[PDB]
Amino acid sequence: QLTTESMPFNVAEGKEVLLLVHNLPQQLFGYSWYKGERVDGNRQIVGYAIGTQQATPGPANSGRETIYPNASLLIQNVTQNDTGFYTLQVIKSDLVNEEATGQFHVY
Amino acid sequence: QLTTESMPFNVAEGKEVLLLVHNLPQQLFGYSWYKGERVDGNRQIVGYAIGTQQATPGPANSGRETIYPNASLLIQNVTQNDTGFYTLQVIKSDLVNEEATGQFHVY
Ligand SMILES: *[C@@H]1O[C@H](CO)[C@@H](O)[C@H](O)[C@H]1NC(C)=O
Ligand SMILES: *[C@@H]1O[C@H](CO)[C@@H](O)[C@H](O)[C@H]1NC(C)=O
Ligand SMILES: *[C@@H]1O[C@H](CO)[C@@H](O)[C@H](O)[C@H]1NC(C)=O
Structure with missing residues (x-):
């Protein structure tokens, strides 16, 4: 049910892409x-804690990524190296967690 | 740094194994x-929420597994099909999470 949607799916080099997240579980x-x-x-790339409303970069953060409170991810100034797969994990309140994998293609 | 240790590493069919967890992070x-x-x-197999102090089974729970508040995992009555790889994920309070993969051999 949890899914992602790239906006746009095909991204021009140097432009931005927003990974939309649909069907978030209720208690996260x-x-x-x-x-x-x-x-x-x-x-x-990043971790986001809902209660403190806090974003913290991980090892793959490059300084180009923004995460929003609804879990959408913005990547600015995309390069050919950003092409391919991204994985979202949502941490549920029972710690039985869910994943969704999205993708975009830079040309 | 986060590591697991199988106790014992070689486990006789029908016996039990305890996956000890070492180097746990402070804020979880x-x-x-x-x-x-x-x-x-x-x-x-299981998710364990520290705040509610509750274990919740996942799809791979078989009724033979117990997780402890220090993240150690006990598996009773192992079979040859249980041999191989297990993965621990520790969810930190900043959502920058850590993984460790352990292993045992059933004989
Ligand atoms: C993206 O590139 C533009 C043009 O070089 C620059 O002005 C902008 O600050 C960059 N954005 C980030 C987040 O680095
Ligand atoms: C998530 O929030 C962002 C930022 O406000 C917004 O652009 C986007 O539409 C939201 N996602 C959904 C699925 O509505
Ligand atoms: C975790 O707790 C269990 C149960 O009290 C104990 O047997 C085990 O030794 C503990 N693990 C460590 C690494 O202390």
């Missing part, structure tokens, strides 16, 4: 975004 | 264990 503690197809701390 | 929301080498909600 926070969000974590990753580069790639896997939840992997070594590739985490 | 909870823990999640998975069967396999990936964080994947479809293979989640």
